[PDB]
């Protein structure tokens with residue numbers, strides 16, 4: 001099964017978006033787009049959390065189905081976060097794995113980037 | 119090979135914190151996840167602003183210079199995956215549904231900054247149906 005990071009690679013290739021094989025310093029325009037998309041989706045997460053909190057405050061008993069907009073927005077946020085890493089040429093899974101290693105047990109992301117060049 | 123969502127599950131088992139099926143959370147837990155999302159987002163925002171300033175000064179960035187951004191981005195994945203896992207929601211099921219509906223945008227126009235937009239007749243992911251599938255075994 002494809003990982004979510006590999007899925008981003010498929011998406012960018014299907015839309016004609018830069019998706020380099022190895023870590024690649026980016027043009028400013030790429031950085032600016034990635035910041036915009038991250039701001040867009042994290043605002044949507046925030047708004048969907050605010051709706052849940054407001055309903056709960058008024059006594060509503062949330063159902064599982066009631067979580068679908070927030071889950072959708074959280075997945076959208078994953079999507080643009082992975083997307084930033086993909087457009088930088090950086091294997092997100094390799095960086096996530098090193099972060100996970102440190103949390104589970106210090107993350108050397110600089111070392112992962114260096115290794116990804118080769 | 120474990121996915122990143124499954125790694126978050128492992129991490130939550132290791133620290134003593136999560137449901138198997140979608141479960142409405144207590145409000146305090148929501149406020150907590152928002153706080154964690156807000157802290158890692160701000161790190162990402164400042165690091166990109168950091169790199170943008172260096173380029174505006176004329177610096178040619180190297181791949182090595184990308185490590186704090188890559189680190190901040192992975193921390194953001196971690197707490198975003200963590201949010202879905204504490205909700206009892208399988209991130210990979212949701213993501214696969216979001217992904218299929220993003221692939222279907224390929225023929226749409228593009229915004230000036232490069233954002234892919236939706237073509238005529240596009241239809242969104244049915245994340246409600248994913249939740250119901252997850253809720254009902």
Ligand SMILES: O=c1ccn([C@H]2C[C@H](O)[C@@H](COP(=O)(O)O)O2)c(=O)[nH]1
Pocket residue numbers: 037040075076077079080083216220232233234235236
């Ligand atoms: O250039 C783009 C345009 C869209 N998306 C994905 C992120 C979200 O999953 C979703 C957001 O699209 P909008 O609903 O905001 O148009 O599409 C990208 O990854 N890159």
